[PDB]
Design a protein around this ligand. Structure first.
Ligand code: ZN
Lengths: 128, 171, 187
């Protein structure tokens, strides 16, 4: 009934906002910071550690300002909220690669313009 | 896919917890119950980002408990059929490959694995390698798999990873 | 009554019905309409036996019946059942009975993919491939049955799959004469 490729989601997943792994890491880090405070409180569950490592491993942006800048530029482009997370998560190097992964992305914009959008993410991306 | 959504949960607070710090206990009790539990509709729940509001505590007639409906914002991850998500291989076996994606764990059957891949029992660390060794998949590697289907049982969800589709596997 | 219609009806009755059905059809071919009572004497069949065949023929609408009521010479009421062949309605039923098999053949192609291969020998219950991983016990490292705690095999389900494939080619060959006749009866 629900397919990511077909952009079909249930009524619950309609107004939901998608957060990038780097954005997710910041929120989880804030939880960790609060965890240290208020000693003797409940210790965070092991599931929290698993996700925190996962988001940190795939974190494409280590700077808070860059994450905001990427989101601001993406907001100008008329892109679906779910597709924005995939675009900023997978970070395809080529326009053709992005189109193949997401069949629904075909026809949204011009191929030449699609490649430029991906290239911009690379410039903001920090290589270590 | 990671989603930040608002969830409805009900807390039954024992009368012993009444008095000062009642709402603190309700908030604290919310984290313990929600965290570490998964449901098919929303999948695994990582943590509660914040609590939107605590509803009026309706006393249960006879029971003595007070039912507190809580609107809390939490981030959850749910496997979507026909979707490609990065995965980390935990264990390698001839029968199939086990991979963990955050709290969710995915199992890859031998049939779904590409034909050219063959189990490497001789090597001390079990792994899948080709004849030409162009691509090698072993434990603790980042690979891409397609979620063929989603199954939920006993508050646990584990999907099937298939590497038949192109642009999959170790990159 | 074009000769093509007569031959088409004969070819189908002798292929999927008993000799009883075919014999009654010949009477309706020689004469456009024949009384039910008259047909009974010629065939010498039992009263119930003839009705059962006629009901089956009427069930498939290969022939239609009309009731004529008249006063006999002795004054008693007479209710004669007159049977006749409706080619226009008959051809549709033949097409309906043929397309369903063709669509059933198409369905057989999809059934082969969803067949359940895993099965427990103890409880003799077959489980789908997707359901197989549900019962997978990590401690054992192999498929198992929760009810029986016994190993689950999949080799027994491979043999019957190939049998259905052979029927596809044969069905299309034996049915060509019927299809050819249908094309000749479109006018
Ligand atoms: Zn059994």
């Amino acid at each position: 009934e629900e397919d990511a490729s077909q952009l079909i989601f249930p009524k619950e997943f309609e107004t939901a906002e998608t957060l990038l792994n780097s954005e997710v890491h910041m929120l989880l880090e804030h939880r960790k910071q609060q965890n240290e405070s208020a000693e003797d409180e409940q210790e965070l569950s092991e599931v929290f550690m698993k996700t925190l490592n996962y988001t940190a491993r795939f974190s494409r942006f280590k700077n808070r300002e860059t994450i905001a800048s990427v989101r601001s530029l993406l907001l100008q482009k008329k892109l679906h909220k779910f597709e924005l997370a995939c675009l900023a998560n997978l970070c395809p190097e080529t326009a053709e690669e992005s189109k193949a992964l997401i069949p629904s992305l075909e026809g949204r914009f011009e191929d030449e313009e699609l490649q430029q959008i991906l290239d911009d993410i690379q410039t903001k991306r920090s290589f270590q | 896919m990671f989603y930040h959504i608002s969830l409805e949960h009900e807390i039954l607070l024992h009368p012993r917890y009444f008095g000062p710090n009642l709402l603190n206990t309700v908030k604290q009790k919310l984290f313990t119950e929600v965290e570490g539990t998964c449901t098919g509709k929303y999948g695994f729940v990582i943590a509660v980002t914040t609590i939107d509001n605590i509803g009026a505590g309706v006393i249960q007639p006879g029971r003595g408990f007070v039912l507190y409906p809580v609107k809390y914002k939490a981030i959850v991850f749910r496997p979507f059929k026909g979707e490609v998500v990065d995965a980390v291989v935990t264990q390698v076996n001839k029968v199939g490959l086990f991979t963990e994606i955050g709290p969710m764990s995915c199992f890859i059957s031998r049939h779904s694995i590409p034909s050219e891949m063959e189990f490497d029992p001789n090597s001390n660390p079990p792994c899948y390698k080709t004849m030409d060794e162009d691509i090698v998949i072993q434990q603790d590697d980042e690979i891409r798999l397609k979620i063929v289907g989603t199954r939920v049982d006993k508050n646990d969800i584990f999907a099937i990873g298939s590497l038949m589709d192109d642009y999959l596997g170790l990159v | 009554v074009p000769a093509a219609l007569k031959r088409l009806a004969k070819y189908v009755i002798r292929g999927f019905y008993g000799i009883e059905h075919a014999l009654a059809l010949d009477i309706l071919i020689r004469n456009s309409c024949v009384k039910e009572e008259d047909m009974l004497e010629l065939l010498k069949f039992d009263r119930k036996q003839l009705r059962s065949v006629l009901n089956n023929l009427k069930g498939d609408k290969f022939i239609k019946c009309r009731m004529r009521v008249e006063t006999a010479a002795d004054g008693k009421t007479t209710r004669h059942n007159y049977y006749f062949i409706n080619y226009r309605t008959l051809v549709n039923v033949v097409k309906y009975k043929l397309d369903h098999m063709r669509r059933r053949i198409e369905t057989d192609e999809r059934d082969s993919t969803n067949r359940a291969s895993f099965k427990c020998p103890v409880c003799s219950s077959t489980f789908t491939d997707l359901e197989a991983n549900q019962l997978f016990d990590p401690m054992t490292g192999t498929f198992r049955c929760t009810f029986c705690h016994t190993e689950v095999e999949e080799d027994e389900s491979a043999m019957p799959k190939k049998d259905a494939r052979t029927l596809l080619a044969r069905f299309n060959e034996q049915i060509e004469p019927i299809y050819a006749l249908l094309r000749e009866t479109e006018d």
